[PDB]
Amino acid sequence: GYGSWEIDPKDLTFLKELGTGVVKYGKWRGQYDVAIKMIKEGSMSEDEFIEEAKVMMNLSHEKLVQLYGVCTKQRPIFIITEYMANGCLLNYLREMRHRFQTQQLLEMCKDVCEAMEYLESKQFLHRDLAARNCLVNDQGVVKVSDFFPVRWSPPEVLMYSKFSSKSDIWAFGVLMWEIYSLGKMPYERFTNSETAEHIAQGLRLYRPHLASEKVYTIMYSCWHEKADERPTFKILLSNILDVMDEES
Numbered sequence: 001g002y003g004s005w006e007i008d009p010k011d012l013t014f015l016k017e018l019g020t021g022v023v024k025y026g027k028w029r030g031q032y033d034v035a036i037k038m039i040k041e042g043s044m045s046e047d048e049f050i051e052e053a054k055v056m057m058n059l060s061h062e063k064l065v066q067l068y069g070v071c072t073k074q075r076p077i078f079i080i081t082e083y084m085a086n087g088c089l090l091n092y093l094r095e096m097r098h099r100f101q102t103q104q105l106l107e108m109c110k111d112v113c114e115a116m117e118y119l120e121s122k123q124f125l126h127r128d129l130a131a132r133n134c135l136v137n138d139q140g141v142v143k144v145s146d147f148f149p150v151r152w153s154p155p156e157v158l159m160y161s162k163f164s165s166k167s168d169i170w171a172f173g174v175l176m177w178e179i180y181s182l183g184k185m186p187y188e189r190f191t192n193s194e195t196a197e198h199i200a201q202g203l204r205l206y207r208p209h210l211a212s213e214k215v216y217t218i219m220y221s222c223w224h225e226k227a228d229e230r231p232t233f234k235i236l237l238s239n240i241l242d243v244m245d246e247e248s
């Protein structure tokens with residue numbers, strides 16, 4: 001048993017499909033908006049499901065998509081999370097520009113940075129940080145979810161498979177760039193193969209027009225060739241707050 005995490009499936013009402021594992025929008029006990037993830041039989045393993053669910057049971061933060069419970073005494077198994085009304089951040093940046101101004105781009109960055117500082121403090125590596133893996137709620141708050149993506153990877157990952165806190169740092173820099181470019185694909189004119197070659201040669205993503213020099217300095221610091229020279233999420237958060245105060 002998963003203790004207080006076990007949800008009675010009778011308390012769920014299904015309303016709309018969100019993506020297809022099948023994810024749906026619904027309500028829990030007719031009061032709370034939820035997303036219901038229906039893991040289809042055959043995918044994953046005995047141990048694989050147990051790990052990932054318990055990962056979500058042990059991590060909790062205002063800027064991380066929150067697990068509400070699990071339905072495991074039946075097939076298919078349900079995962080129930082908080083509902084993020086505005087969907088995927090990547091689509092939001094591309095399709096919902098009428099809902100946010102330039103000043104709010106930095107706020108999106110801060111939201112993600114707070115999530116990552118928390119994960120960092122728990123010694124938990126995300127390993128796939130990108131706009132496509134963040135969600136946006138009804139108030140426009142960005143939250144990290146889902147805790148090969150060549151375009152989000154540092155040279156040591158691409159060359160040596162060296163994952164660390166510092167590869168998450170690199171990816172976060174790329175995410176800032178996604179936000180400030182309003183959802184452009186990083187290295188937009190290159191293939192993954194070309195991106196890898198260019199990164200290793202010291203090529204870096206250009207400053208998006210919407211990013212000030214100070215904002216660019218923040219994302220650029222994430223891309224130091226030397227992993228040990230990249231900041232921590234604690235440092236990035238302080239930097240972001242400093243720029244927020246100076247630019248508003």
Ligand SMILES: CCN(CC)CCOc1ccc(Nc2ncc3cc(Oc4ccc(F)cc4)c(=O)n(C)c3n2)cc1
Binds near residue numbers: 147
């Ligand atoms: C107009 C077309 N529209 C159809 C209505 C397209 C869909 O637009 C939307 C609209 C709202 C959402 N919101 C939304 N909210 C919560 C979750 C939780 C999920 O499970 C997790 C599982 C693990 C985890 F770590 C975090 C969350 C998950 O998977 N997805 C997707 C979610 N999507 C997502 C997409």
